[PDB]
Amino acid sequence: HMSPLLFPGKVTVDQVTDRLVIADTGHHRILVVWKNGQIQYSIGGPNPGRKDGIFSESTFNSPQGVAIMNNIIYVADTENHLIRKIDLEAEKVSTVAGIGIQGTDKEGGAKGEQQPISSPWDVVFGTSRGDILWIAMAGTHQIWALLLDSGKLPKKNELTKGTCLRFAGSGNEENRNNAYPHKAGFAQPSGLSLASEDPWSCLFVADSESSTVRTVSLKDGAVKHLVGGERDPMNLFAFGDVDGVGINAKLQHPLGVTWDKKRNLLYVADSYNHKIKVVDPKTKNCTTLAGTGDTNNVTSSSFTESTFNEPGGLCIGENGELLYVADTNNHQIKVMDLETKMVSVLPIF
């Protein structure tokens, strides 16, 4: 109980300042820290709530996904079933989607606080300038979008700012890929990462209950298998810990993905296996990058001898030099140096 963090589920990196944003999930607060670990903002706490307003009165409820661009942070405020907006310039928290209770709507289409949502778990910025917030909607097994400005989703017509709706996923809890996004099926999708550039042009999805990684095309929304699971779209009992190509790889409840555009590699928080995996989206090869699989925590080690404990999220740093891991059940951000192949613990001060 001595770490300043408690079960931190997610971490992201600000691309223009190199700051980190940490969802300190168990303390119901969001941290903004400089890359050396010095805290700049602590927003929320100590108890769960859904209060908006100035920073000192704002509260969250077991938040997960965090995304930052241009001094605005969006929060998958999971247990409130809300998307929240932290405006660092104005030092105000606001609510931009959800009604504060768990929705069952598998389609969406309403604006903002008129639209019920269900256990949002991860968020990333996209571009139809950062005018889309993509949402891993774990509660209804779907990928959703919030329009931050008016714009068009892939193959759709323009929708007004604030529209919040399903993009991919039927709503059935399945491991189902499809040429048409509404006919695909996900199973507790919990991690997203954007690869907007050719030849990828996709969102990568950590599909936790199917133990797979999928791609969702930003050209036409086609949902495709990348690694893990089995062919049967109803089989959610297809987990394990196996390095291999495509369908031969086995994951266990992966909660996070992050795209490394420098190396054209995808890193995966393979949470229940206590490992970080690396996927080459070309060869579809999934191999172990770091983690022995045991949960005896060591604070300094090589990649191969490092340990994690259900890491809930991760994010590549600027220019792909460092990989930050929300090492959830160790209450730490682990810093993986991709040049020295060493793992350390981010100090928080």
| DSSP labels, 22-89 | EEEGGGTEEEEE-TTS-EEEEEE-SS-----EEGGG---SS---EEEETTEEEEEEGGGTEEEEEETT
Give yes or no for a cis peptide into 199 (omega within 30° of 0): yes
Q: Which residue, among 62, 193, 71, has the nearest Cα to 125 in the 3D structure?
A: 193
CA distance 151 to 201: 17
Phi-psi region of 257 (alpha: psi -120 to 50; beta: other; left: phi over 0): beta
Which value in Å is the resolution of this experimental model?
A: 1.7
Are residues 276 and 291 in contact, defined by beta-carbon separation less than 8 angstroms? yes
Q: Which residues fall within 8 angstroms of residue 162, CB to CB, at 6 or more apart?
A: 96, 111, 112, 146, 147
- Residue 139 gets which letter from DSSP? G
Domain count within the chain: 1
Tokens 């969001």 map to which residue? Answer: 30
**Three-point CA angle 123, 78, 164, nearest 5°:** 55
How far lies 186's CA from each of 183, 271, 295, in Å? 10, 18, 29
Q: Which residue, among 264, 268, 256, has the nearest Cα to 281 in the 3D structure?
A: 264
CA distance 32 to 184: 36
Q: Which residues fall within 8 angstroms of residue 209, CB to CB, at 6 or more apart?
A: 173, 187, 188, 236, 253
Q: Which residue, among 138, 174, 132, has the nearest Cα to 154 in the 3D structure?
A: 132
Resolved by? X-ray
CA distance 192 to 153: 16
Tokens 């690869």 map to which residue? Answer: 195
**What tokens appear for 221 in the block?**
């929304």
What domain range includes position 270?
A: 1-349
**What tokens appear for 254 in the block?**
């992966």
